[PDB]
Amino acid sequence: MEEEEVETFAFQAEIAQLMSLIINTFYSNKEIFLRELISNSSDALDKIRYESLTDPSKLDSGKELHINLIPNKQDRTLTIVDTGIGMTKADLINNLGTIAKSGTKAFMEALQAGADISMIGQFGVGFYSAYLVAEKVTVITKHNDDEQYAWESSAGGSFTVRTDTGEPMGRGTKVILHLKEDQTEYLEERRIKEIVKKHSQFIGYPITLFVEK
Ligand SMILES: Cc1cc(C)c2cc1C(=O)NCCCNC(=O)CCSc1cc-2nc(N)n1
């Protein structure tokens, strides 16, 4: 019998409250979740690109800088993969739930005052827009300085971190969105193309879309 170690964490209370606002409030422009995730991937790709200017050995783990979009109707998942800088275990725990960075409180309060969801990325909490369309999010990441980890949350105030048992990545991050039953439009080629063309036209890395037969 295989034994796997899991670490469970509570979201920092303001992040939990922001997540509750995103999950329990209707917002009309939900499609921006994809812009936010592609933006995070592009930022991660910039970090490894700029670091590689003085240290080419940082690309030993992979020299291609790109993004893949993978919908899967059977699993009801939309996956965004990049070959960006990735996150170490510390980065993952620090940035994906235990610390409310400046932006979290300001945006949470802006949403409580009736603001739209559109500017979420400006407040540095764009990742959490995944919860407009997903009931569960899994983040797989690999940084040069560490092992491959899997973060996962179905909201409800908690998340888990474990060393990943899935397919290997040389370096980068994979965000797997387990879509809500009424948000399956985001598995459609036409809808994904619409959103990429509307919101991510100027992304400086190539995006490959895998279209299901
Ligand atoms: C909340 C959050 C969630 C994810 C999944 C990423 C970044 C952040 C974030 O706001 N980090 C704030 C810190 C700045 N971002 C980084 O340093 C990138 C680490 S790699 C990376 C990180 C993320 N997503 C991808 N695709 N690659």
Curated annotation (Swiss-Prot):
Effect of residue 86 to D: Abolishes ATPase activity
Residues binding ATP: 40, 82, 101, 127
Top-rank taxon, per record: Eukaryota
Impact reported for residue 82 to A: Impaired ATP-binding. Strong interaction with HIF1A, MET, KEAP1 and RHOBTB2. Loss of interaction with HSF1 and ERBB2. Los of interaction with TSC1
Region (Interaction with NR3C1) location: 1-213
Consequence of substituting residue 36 to A: Strong ATP-binding. Strong interaction with HSF1, HIF1A, ERBB2, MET, KEAP1 and RHOBTB2. No effect on interaction with TSC1
PTM remark: ISGylated.
Modified residues (N6-acetyllysine): 47, 73
Subcellular location field: Nucleus; Cytoplasm; Melanosome; Cell membrane
Signal peptide limits: none
Protein task: Molecular chaperone that promotes the maturation, structural maintenance and proper regulation of specific target proteins involved for instance in cell cycle control and signal transduction. Undergoes a functional cycle that is linked to its ATPase activity which is essential for its chaperone activity. This cycle probably induces conformational changes in the client proteins, thereby causing their activation. Interacts dynamically with various co-chaperones that modulate its substrate recognition, ATPase cycle and chaperone function.
Record's comment describing the protein's domains: The TPR repeat-binding motif mediates interaction with TPR repeat-containing proteins like the co-chaperone STUB1.
Homology family: Belongs to the heat shock protein 90 family.
Assembly: Homodimer. Identified in NR3C1/GCR steroid receptor-chaperone complexes formed at least by NR3C1, HSP90AA1 and a variety of proteins containing TPR repeats such as FKBP4, FKBP5, PPID, PPP5C or STIP1. Forms a complex containing HSP90AA1, TSC1 and TSC2; TSC1 is required to recruit TCS2 to the complex. The closed form interacts (via the middle domain and TPR repeat-binding motif) with co-chaperone TSC1 (via C-terminus). Interacts with TOM34. Interacts with TERT; the interaction, together with PTGES3, is required for correct assembly and stabilization of the TERT holoenzyme complex. (Microbial infection) Interacts with herpes simplex virus 1 protein US11; this interaction inhibits TBK1-induced interferon production.
Protein name: Heat shock protein HSP 90-alpha
Origin species: Homo sapiens (Human)
Protein encoded by which gene: HSP90AA1
